[PDB]
Symmetry: C2
């Protein structure tokens, strides 16, 4: 029959979808969410054999274990055990595009298990097997007898095994296909993996059973009264003595209870549902659920007889919350949401797409600790535990149907085809049937990047009909179609229009006010966090705060999709697409996360945390205004610490308790600050600290911060006249300057400081030279490759103009003796094929104090692409343990991503001054720096710098971070000016005009001396 | 696999649905709609073997013909050849209700055909088979090899046979199943038949082919400009030299043309459809399509090369029209429709559910001739030729999906179940894909009586998305749900509310103005035409005309669903449900047609014609005002004939051409009419006559009529005093009156006129007695049965009150002699077990002129159910050929169904005074009669009458019309008063209060004399 090549067959003998069941036979166990004896896990050691096609599977495998088979752990993806390569591709399909057919060579995973069943399970009731996730399709046998078939990798497939099992030993056989017609709806850009990758379980239900239940909560106008409505469905024989009781619990306190026999209200001419009942419980002053305060109740559904004998019980966590769009605003409990969201794929660097509790909790804690309140299930229903954890920890969830057809041409080719409506309907309907009782799910999504087809309109309406409690969104076909309640674009910019034909990405501010438009706007994807990125992140949040109908968005994305590989020595290294031998591939485009695969933060995470802060600050005189952005909670775990420092030297500090109502304001008057005697700039830093630990954070957690410049006292005092006078020694090749045992050598051929000496010790391994380039970031490169060059990309514009190739031509090199100093004057021109790109004019002034004052004035040809940087570089002989600077830090920061960084005195190990981006680039920059200290050296001015053991050349020429080698000495890059990093997306230039180096003429000055 | 018990499997290897194809290889043949050699009919003689189950089918049938098999005509229903019994059932399922399972005893029809295929068909291109209608499911084999599977009895199933066929002799094997999971969606109230009941064909297409095309017509504000947009899709290899030309023709004149290569506009980020193109043709002053003037163009779609070589051509008829709902009104071409509709099942008394052109054309002609402009496809897509004929003759069509689940408890059990959404979607989507190019289709329907479920809402939105040119309607779940653009109730009454729980049927006038309601109301079913019915029909049309938003409805229904059976002598008779040995059955509830199965009209059809007239009339003095109800056409085939008569005697007549604009008025001034010499009532009759023949009518066709009373001259002149004096003779048992040769005998024990003589000739066979009962109409009975009594039904109320058993008790019987007359005075009481139901007081006055004046005064007990009639009856000895009367006629007419009848002198054969309803009842009544003549007898007064060879007793006791026997003499029923017939529905009392005999006291008077 080849059911895996037929979209008319998505399942065979599969049971109906339903909310999580456990079939408790004790009500109290249901109430407390204790493990149920009737729900058994079949996870663990299974038998597995790989085959090139389903035709290669020997008939004997159905009857008994194959000797060639291995013992593997389930759940698992079989690629993670090295049976075949995990394929990765971005836009194009991993297979030949000819629907509904798949390749004849279809990797087949043969799973089997020998397991025990209690006789009590078979003497009464129903025994079913539950596969929470099988990728992408499977056939099931039990004791040699065929049971059924299933598709959709991301939802549970359940089969009745009551007629198949025997008491004692039984054997399952599961034939898993890598490719099916299901694969055409599963084109998410990620590692293409297969197998039994989610839990396998056995569930025993009584013959007379709860088959479905739906929980709704309606509210009065001010949410002081609620009605919990619970619809319960049954299967089996209806009897007059049957009853349903629904009880509601707040912790250990029962708040309400209701009992009724079966028999629903009349709904049409033929009567009503005899096999259903709806219970209604009044709740006075309900404790409302939100991400801020995840108040939960417990609902217990008891199926029983009139005399009080329990048949079975089911239960769920209930969150009293209302989600509605009104007057163009998404409201939760009557209040407008501001979505601090992120997209999160299910990814583990070691276990692939297998999810576990520890990884999930780790993600949620890190998200909430970094001021995220929302998550998008990109792009499929998640492991069932995810929702439980989001209910309890408090996160807003967008639950998304497992439908992506991004490789189709055009994108809507399947989704506009009525012949694919059945298969698509199943992916939407079975998701809703499973997850509808979770309070954390506030929005349904119809899938991702599948264009806009009629099937979307149909399924949009289906959800609106069955579940009016949640808005429906969908981005395909231009982000504002008739299939979405929310304008939900991907990578629409703040101020800049991108007017693509048919599917424009308008400025988000402009999009809101288009003729006739009234809906809220929440970006389903924004701020592409690929490599050194999140440039311009602050621009989004300023817009979100200013515009009521701009209600936030979901960052792309949470975690790098890298996998661990082992070299010749067996050492682990982070691998991306193309490293597993898969071709065609899309290189490092799978790594766009705010955290590394091991959940170590990227520098961008702190920028996200700062901008997503829940308290806003203003300073007027001595008064600090604190405004709460919380909608529900008072600031009952918040203390404001303030500190005033003169150039990093602390002068005054204090702490004030925060007492701010939701949306409220608190004024804090600072005490009289003493005027410092010394020159310099006073800086005020405030931080919000959480004194008490929570479910999601430790005691002392910092949740918010802000800085201001206070009084500045400019230095007017002249330094004391120096006793020593520097001497100029002139040879043919060199201008030399001597001061005691110190020496500065300027090569007259090159026109650069070629060496410095302190006694017999040399300071430089490479001369001090101008630098106008950086090792290209992911955003500089875009989609440009060696075989497919994108001439628009920043790196290619730099390469074509000769920026990386330009040679310094000496125009001038003179030396003059002043009264108290030696003045070296130089001029250079960087040319490429007759074209002067840059001109650098310098003076070097060395006086008796041992200070070298360097003045730099650069010309940049108006018609050359704006340079990545304007600065100097050298390789220092010194290798020191610590780096000490007065400037923005402590973390890496760039001009369009420095809001999170604070001005202060910072001291870090040299290793912290390098960011280990998997794909090496310009990294570790610190801006707004007024003083830098490294070993004996001190640099003073107003500059940007990075400092590491890796040259810009090595970073540029090395593909992976694990292939990098520490060079001799220390490479220093000191920039007068540095270009923004961008990141609005990673496939087109995204650096905003104000962060491009376009002024034409630039000036900076430095002082180099010994500390 | 048992695919016929799986709602997830509705087809295997079935090709996509599409508009009618013929694959012409000649453009002129496509333009002219001539037969195509590439479309071959496989209709004719096939081989057939019946089996009790699919398991009972021998494996040799796949390869070789069975000797036990018979030769049958295809298309056919196998129940019509007597293989098994055609089951009839209304609300209940004919099978055990256990979805998706069907009975193990599942009658299986094995069809096979051996046929020739020419090598040329297989050498190149694609050969497909098309089964237009197979009931209910089937597997297909070709030359022993399995091809595919299909469900949905009412749409074509198509399969590619290109790889299966061989040059020369080929054999098809079709295993048809009576029951499948498809049956759960096919629970229409009709005969349950099966087999290959629509056409079978072979279609040859090239490999590079037109695979789909859609035609839209859009207009400017005043319909003076139009754009025809034609989307053309292809299959096969795309080449740059490929072209599509769409040409539009008005007869033999090409009005527009457009040519383009393949490649549609960009629709998303992935581009557009390379295999599609859209052509736009401008049309100035288009001739518009309507039911009034069915103007058609021909669109020809040519697939060709750039150098001019035709590959293939497809085509369709195009009607330029716009259907939209605006401000609560359904509009066609800017004008509000008034739907004069009827429901039409596909039924033939000899061929069952097999349809032919002759029958279809016969139905359409009769419909249009009786002023119908609309048809509802109750309850499934029709034979493809139906739409062609409606396009060409001009009828508005509601195309309805083959979805009915009336037997489900509750009615929406399947339609609210997402697991049934795939199967339901196919029934909707494949209908739209087939029929979307037909201009006659103006409204889509989601099916019938399937409650309201979320699946309806999903499919409603699907249609709205893919085809915004047509409104969507659906009655289920209360007629006004979110799945309907039109309030479309079944059997909602005009003034009377029926407030059923959950699904009330409001008064249609009330329904429109319910809080928040804005939609149009068109009844999907109304005026149930079961037996002697359509009482109160005029009430609907008065309402339709008065209320803008009441836009008509569809009568239930067109044709009686009786079948032909034969007796011992081979004489045919009409059989209903239960006559074919099927049980449980719903008796004569299959016969609700306006015409008999052979298309002979019921009397009700003339009432429909008159009420649905397109011209309205008013009279003011001498002025006749004629108002056109046409929306588009001038009255360019209409002449007004007027006649003035005095008690049936013509005094003046004339004719005036009608020249009335649509919606316009014409005033016609009648000439000076001379005052008559005689006493009596002048009557004016007008009729609209069509002088010219049309496509749908003959010359002289009468389309409209109306009558008014003019001047009346009351008779004041005393008749010449009669010389003869009647004489009274008294015995103990009789009062006898003598006048020359004439004798009247009144029995003194009974109190009735027992005999009359003229010479030796006796006039009566049964005495003249009061009658208060009628042989019960289908409406009087409702759903009441002998085993299941409905005590609310009129017949049961009458029975329980003793009306049929009432025995006359004599209270008074006297004889008086007047100067010139004999006076007989009588009084009777009708009592049932001590209770007096009626009292009748009479006088009989016989004077010297031979005239017997009868005065009747009746008392009806206020607490007895209102009587069916208040009259007299007798069995006359005479059998005469003709019946002549001055009153309403010529056809049968009742108090609530007499608007179509005209007051004139009528003369018919006796047999025309009996209406042969298949289920015998009171019939043949004529109302408002002032004079009746039969043989030697004349009756004068103001009465209702019927006259036949059948007593009320025989009509009541005889089940079928073919079992009736002419009794001796002639049964005369003369009523002072007669109850209404009702018919708003036929399962509850429907006789309106104004037509019930509730006055308590009644008076009428008759004169009986010799003519
Ligand atoms: Mg399949
Ligand atoms: Mg700041
Ligand atoms: Mg089926
Ligand atoms: Mg009239
Ligand atoms: Na906002
Ligand atoms: Na990605
Ligand atoms: Na606090
Ligand atoms: Na690199
Ligand atoms: Na109307
Ligand atoms: Na019927
Ligand atoms: Na005329
Ligand atoms: Na009868």
């Amino acid at each position: 029959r080849r059911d895996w090549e037929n979209p008319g067959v998505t399942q065979l003998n599969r049971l109906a979808a339903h909310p999580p069941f456990a079939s408790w036979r004790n009500s109290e166990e249901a109430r407390t969410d204790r493990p149920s004896q009737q729900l058994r896990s079949l996870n663990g050691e299974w038998r597995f054999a790989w085959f090139p096609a389903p035709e290669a599977v020997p008939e004997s495998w159905l009857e008994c274990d194959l000797p060639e088979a291995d013992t593997v752990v389930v759940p698992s993806n079989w690629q993670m055990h090295g049976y075949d390569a995990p394929i990765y591709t971005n836009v194009t399909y991993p297979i030949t595009v000819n629907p509904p057919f798949v390749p004849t060579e279809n990797p087949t995973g043969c799973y089997s298990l020998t397991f025990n069943v209690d006789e009590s399970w078979l003497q009464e009731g129903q025994t079913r097997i539950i596969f929470d996730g099988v990728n992408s399709a499977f056939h099931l046998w039990c004791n040699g007898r065929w049971v059924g078939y299933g598709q959709d990798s991301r939802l549970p497939s359940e089969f009745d095994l009551s007629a198949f099992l025997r008491a004692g030993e039984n054997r399952l056989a599961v034939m898993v296909l890598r490719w099916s017609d299901g694969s055409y709806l599963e084109d998410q850009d990620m590692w293409r993996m297969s197998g039994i990758f989610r839990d396998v379980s056995l569930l025993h239900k009584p013959t007379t059973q709860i088959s479905d239940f739906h929980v709704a909560t309606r509210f009065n106008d001010d949410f002081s009264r609620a009605v919990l409505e619970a619809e319960v469905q049954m299967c089996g024989e209806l009897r007059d003595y049957l009853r349903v009781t629904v009880s509601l619990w707040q912790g250990e306190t029962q708040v309400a209870s209701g009992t009724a026999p079966f028999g629903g209200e009349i709904i049409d001419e033929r009567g009503g549902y005899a096999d259903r009942v709806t219970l209604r419980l009044n709740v006075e002053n309900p404790k409302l659920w939100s991400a801020e305060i995840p108040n939960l109740y417990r609902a217990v559904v008891e199926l029983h007889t009139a005399d009080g004998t329990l048949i079975e019980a089911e239960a769920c966590d209930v969150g009293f919350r209302e989600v509605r769009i009104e007057n163009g605003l998404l409201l939760l409990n009557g209040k407008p949401l501001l979505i601090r969201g992120v997209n999160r794929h299910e990814h583990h660097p070691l276990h692939g797409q297998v999810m576990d509790e520890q990884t999930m909790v780790q993600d949620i804690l890190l998200m909430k600790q970094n001021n995220f309140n929302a998550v998008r299930c990109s792009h499929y229903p998640n492991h069932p535990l995810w929702y439980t954890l989001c209910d309890r920890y408090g996160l807003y969830v967008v639950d998304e149907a497992n439908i992506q057809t991004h490789g189709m041409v055009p994108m809507n080719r399947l989704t506009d085809d009525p012949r694919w409506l059945p298969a698509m309907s199943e992916r939407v309907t079975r998701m809703v049937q499973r997850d509808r009782n979770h309070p954390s799910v506030i929005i349904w999504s119809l899938g991702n990047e599948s264009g806009h087809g009629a099937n979307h309109d149909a399924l949009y309406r289906w959800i609106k009909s069955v579940d009016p409690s949640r808005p429906v969104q969908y981005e395909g076909g231009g982000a504002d179609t008739t299939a979405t309640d929310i304008i939900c674009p991907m990578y629409a910019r703040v101020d800049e229009d991108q007017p693509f034909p048919a599917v424009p990405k308008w400025s988000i501010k402009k999009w809101l006010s288009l003729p006739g438009e009234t809906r809220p706007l929440i970006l389903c994807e924004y701020a592409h966090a690929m490599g050194n990125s999140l440039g311009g992140f602050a621009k989004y949040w300023q817009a979100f705060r200013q515009y009521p109908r701009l209600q936030g968005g979901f960052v792309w994305d949470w975690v790098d999709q890298s996998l661990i590989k082992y070299d010749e020595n067996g050492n682990p290294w982070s691998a991306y697409g193309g490293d597993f031998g898969d071709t065609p591939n899309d290189r490092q485009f799978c790594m766009n996360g705010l955290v590394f695969a091991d959940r170590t933060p990227h520098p961008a995470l702190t920028e996200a945390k700062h901008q997503q802060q829940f308290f806003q600050f203003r300073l007027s005189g001595q008064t600090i205004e604190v405004t709460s952005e919380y909608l529900f909670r008072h600031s009952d775990n918040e203390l404001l610490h303030w500190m005033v420092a003169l150039d990093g030297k602390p002068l005054a500090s204090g702490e004030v308790p925060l007492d701010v109502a939701p949306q409220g304001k608190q004024l804090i008057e600072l005490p009289e600050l003493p005027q410092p005697e010394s020159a310099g700039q006073l800086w005020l830093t405030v931080r919000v600290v959480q004194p008490n630990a929570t479910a999601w954070s430790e005691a002392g957690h910092i949740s918010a911060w802000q800085q201001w410049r206070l009084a500045e006292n400019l230095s007017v005092t002249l330094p004391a006249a120096s006793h020593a006078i520097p001497h100029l020694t002139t040879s043919e090749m060199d201008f030399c300057i001597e001061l005691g045992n110190k020496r500065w050598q300027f090569n007259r051929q090159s026109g650069f400081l070629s060496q410095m000496w302190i006694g017999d010790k040399k300071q430089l391994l490479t001369p001090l030279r101008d630098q106008f380039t950086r090792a290209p970031l992911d955003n500089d490169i875009g989609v440009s490759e060696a075989t497919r060059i994108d001439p628009n990309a920043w790196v290619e514009r730099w390469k074509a103009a000769g920026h990386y190739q330009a040679e310094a031509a000496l125009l001038q090199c003179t030396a003059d003796t002043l009264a108290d100093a030696v003045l070296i004057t130089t001029a250079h021109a960087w040319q490429h094929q007759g074209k002067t790109l840059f001109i650098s004019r310098k003076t070097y002034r060395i006086d008796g104090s041992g200070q070298m004052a360097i003045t730099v004035d650069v010309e940049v040809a108006s018609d050359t692409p704006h340079p990545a940087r304007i600065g100097l570089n050298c390789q220092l002989a010194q290798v020191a343990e610590r780096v000490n600077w007065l400037g923005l830090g402590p973390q890496e920061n760039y001009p369009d991503r420095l809001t999170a960084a604070c001005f202060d005195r910072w001291d870090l190990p040299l290793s912290d001054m390098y960011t280990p981006y998997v794909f090496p680039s310009e990294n570790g920059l610190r801006c707004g720096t007024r003083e830098l200290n490294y070993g004996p050296h001190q640099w003073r001015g107003d500059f940007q710098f990075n400092i590491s053991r890796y040259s810009q050349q090595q970073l540029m020429e090395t593909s992976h971070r694990h292939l990098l080698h520490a060079e001799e000495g220390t490479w220093l890059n000191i920039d007068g000016f540095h270009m923004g990093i961008g990141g609005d997306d990673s496939w087109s230039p995204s650096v905003s005009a104000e962060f491009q180096l376009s002024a034409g003429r630039y000036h900076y000055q430095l002082v180099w001396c010994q500390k």
